[PDB]
């Protein structure tokens, strides 16, 4: 296989550079604007990080976060995005687990300490559209025409996602493009220019796909918001941004019921993940003319791998495996279940599957045994081949 770089690959995708990619605080950035800034920032990060160095980003959703993440990948660093409001010990544990060289935090955040503590840098106060994260002062201004991408095997780790003792899921160029194609192209068929709004943030793998990657991958644009998603703020964003595609979770759709008319003004594709979408929620929204598509993803599988298809969703159901994925149910003795209406543990293989955990015991890595990911979820299949969640194994 040819050595490649995920950021470089995204930049080569054939979409109009003048179209929007990210929206933030009433402002918009084009593909070209972000690419220029990412390359400039990469030229600075290359003075600080060697290929392979890990980076933890403890930041609220913003274009600067998304661009910094891709600039890290551009230089061969391995970033991970975590909750900016993580307790100090939790951030320390993650930074220690991936042996991070650098942590980028919110303004006024404390410095990391302890054995092999990473360098801590801070975002600027005032929430600028584009932030240098003190790099101008630390390593000097950026180069003007940087393009020194670090190219590596497409199966090698290029970023981490942390969902007990923290476990970092490795994601590679190959399986990232894999989960993007299966979900953004094959399931949702996102179109260039589509305005996307994910309420879940980029420290959740669901939100990272929705907001960080799919805009680049499909030529769409995403609203990024660094404040918490109170129903009041979600409503403000809906009215201001008018997204065509909404990524939520079941409780969010419940909370949006009083604002159904405003949501229906612009939302044509409504997705729900994270936990099962109740029939009552599906049917409330159907009565207002909105189909909600329930699908399951997991960090170890990159994104959604089994879902209701737009135009064909059904209540009280998780739908069908996405193109490229294979799903299997096993009984308590490990035997494959062929019958309908019989629950078992769901295993999955396919394009989005992670190559493994960054640092783990053999027992932890055994969740990936045999080229499948063992979800730990109990599911049953009906005669049509559709799946329904039934709980967690024990
Ligand atoms: N990482 C993701 C990317 C995309 C979309 C979701 C995720 C995501 O949730 O990733 P996590 O690793 O935090 O959690 C995975 C676990 O969450 C549960 N689950 C998720 N979606 C559903 C659903 N629709 N119905 C029923 N259970 C669901 C299930 O227990 C699963 O094992």
Curated annotation (Swiss-Prot):
pH dependence per the UniProt record: Optimum pH is 8.5.
Leading EC class: ligase
Gene Ontology molecular function terms on file: acid-thiol ligase activity; anthranilate-CoA ligase activity; ATP binding
Keywords for the protein's UniProt record, in alphabetical order: ATP-binding, Ligase, Nucleotide-binding
Stated role: Catalyzes the formation of anthraniloyl-CoA, which is the priming step for entry into the Pseudomonas quinolone signal (PQS) biosynthetic pathway. Also active on a variety of aromatic substrates, including benzoate and chloro and fluoro derivatives of anthranilate.
Any one biological process term the GO annotation gives: secondary metabolite biosynthetic process
Residues of the full protein shown: 2 to 399 of 517
Protein name: Anthranilate--CoA ligase
Catalytic activity: anthranilate + ATP + CoA = anthraniloyl-CoA + AMP + diphosphate
Disruption phenotype: Mutants show no detectable levels of 2,4-dihydroxyquinoline (DHQ) or other quinolines.
Family statement drawn from the similarity comment of this UniProt entry: Belongs to the ATP-dependent AMP-binding enzyme family.
Assigned EC number: 6.2.1.32
Binding site residues for AMP: 160-167
Complexes and interactors: Monomer.
